[PDB]
Amino acid sequence: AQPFAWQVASLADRYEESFDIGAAVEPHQLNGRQGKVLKHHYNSIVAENAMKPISLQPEEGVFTWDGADAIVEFARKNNMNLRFHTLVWHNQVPDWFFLDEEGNPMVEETNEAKRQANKELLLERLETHIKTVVERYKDDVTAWDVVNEVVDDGTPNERGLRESVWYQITGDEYIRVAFETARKYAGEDAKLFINDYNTEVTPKRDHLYNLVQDLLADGVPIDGVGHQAHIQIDWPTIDEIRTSMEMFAGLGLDNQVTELDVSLYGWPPRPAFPTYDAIPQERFQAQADRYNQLFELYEELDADLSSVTFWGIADNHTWLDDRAREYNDGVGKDAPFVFDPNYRVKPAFWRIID
Template sequence: MNKICKKKKTFIIHTAALILIFSLWLLSGCQSSMEDIESSEPVTAPAQQIDIEDSAESASDSEENSVVEEDDITDNSESIVIETPPVPSVEEDIPSLAETYIDYFPMGAAIEPFQTTGLKADLLKKHVNWLVAENVMKPDAIQPSEGNFNWENADQIVEFARKNGMEVRFHTLVWHSQIGDWFFKDSEGKPMVDETDPVKREANKTLLLERLDEHVRTVVGRYKDDIISWDVVNEVIEPGDPDGMRASEWYQITGTDFIETAFRAAREAGGPGIKLYINDYGTDNPVKRDRLYELVKVLLEKGVPIDGVGHQTHIDIHGPTVTSIIDSMQKFSELGLDNLVTELDMSIYSWNDRSDFSDDIPEVVLQKQAERYQELFEAFKEHKDILSGVVFWGIADNHTWLHSFPVNRTNAPLLFDQNLNVKSAFWAVVDPSKLPQN
């Protein structure tokens, strides 16, 4: 009897163990199946990050890698297409901006050295025949400390232009900004503007003008055979300051003598073959325009070798009027001076607007920009006898100072978009018949 009981007890234990093992197996199988089902659900990929300054390779893998096939999705799941972001590219089957205007004037763009390679370089080579350095030829970049000249970045732009049959403009020999503080320190290292003793102030003025003369002669002497067009002084007019002259350290220490010194040194170092410009923004404003006119007229009467006026032309889709821009050029041409548009861009915001469209710029805004560009360039072409060139302050919307000025936001001031493709503004300038009809 005990033997029978023991056998039954053993049988029950074995049976229970088998049941437990089987249950665990079933549970494991179900869990595995659930995991397989979950892993087959489509997953939206994160947006692709693209460096649009470099040459792009393939923007995405093959089409089948960007689509989740129905066979891979269980039961009622639907196919989901993962959109690939637009790829930066240079459109080859469109007219060249520079060639379109070959019978009018050169077309240029401001650049940084890193834009001399990759896709941006290809865009420049196709569309412009004039270059200007956005920053690397300014005083602090060229001579960061006294006697220490840095030519590498400037040389890179000059060499890129030479290899690709382009001209170069120089910007800028003298400016109140982006210049080493050492210029304005006296022989003891003290700020010149703080000096009150008349004798020492005169000595400081002499020292500052000597430093300026040396800077100008050294730079012009290096590039006179490569660069014809020169911004000699930049932004010296400010109607809100005393006498309408910008109250920079230059002006506080030397009056207008720094302007005379810079132009005379540039002419002597570069010879009669180079063209020397005084450059400023807001020249469409009659108050500022007239003060600049008065200054230039006096300087010309003193024999200062000024060849022309550079009109920066940082404008927006709301103003100023094209008429006011042309009127300013005509006024200076009456003095026998040349005119250049030196820093053209067109913000999609008015000056007092601090809003941000982000990546959703309304089409009506871009259309208005195109209309304004069309009006502007029709006027430029009509007045080509008083206008010798147009330079954009950039080439495409992915690189513009207006992304951070006057506030951080997305702007779109140029003819090519973030992916280097044409905008309506491009066709407005090159072939308005291709614009969408309202």
């Protein structure tokens, strides 16, 4: 039978000269078999949810550090590097941010003098969040997702920027302030990233490229691009992935794969197999081929790639299951990793360990 993850050679060791091997984690997963898999195979972690804005400051001046601290303590204890996800995002972000002093949404304000005041107030609240968070964790964090998903999937404006409440109120200044603030309190050696999904595909990739290129010209301290890599078996192509990483490397930036999962399905993910046992072996064999091709590319580009993080540990826990259920009437199971629900290795593991 396929051996347990702790009975085989380490991914971290295997890719030691190329890049860190990372996993997204939750506080309750830092023990038992998940703990055993992590220690054996990975030298980097990231919080799946515990370090998002709402997970850290649910109300103004009210900080909930426990989940994040637990993850940090596991990292210290096991010599793990640690990505911070994330300082700025349009989801999992508390409502109080975007309310004026009177308690009304800033987006409803029409008087321009007050719109300005709300803009400054929002940027000041953002600065305080980043200041407090960074000062607490700067000694442990080795990479910062400073902003997350600020580029749109389409072209609602000519710069391709996501028109979240952040944009509606501040334009792009929230992005500038995020990076400036991060740099100020984390120090010159901190690695600051802009993280996003579908970084391999146009036009989104070109809007990201342009944004980064424009901000760099104004001295905004961006060190790298986070490629979420929420990908599929045949999409995006290896060449699209290559081209994207080379473009950002050409601007003097680092690349990191931040949230890798290789879904068994398309987008949307229908049809989906209803259970894990119902997934045919041949799907896992196609996934393995894909994984071989992914990690040969990664290893080929290792001069411009410092870290590869999976968005989970093993197939028993993945946000791709939420997505599967969503598009298949509440029923569906994905299986994106190289370890199965019982922490036994999959074909994909053998194809990236060799």
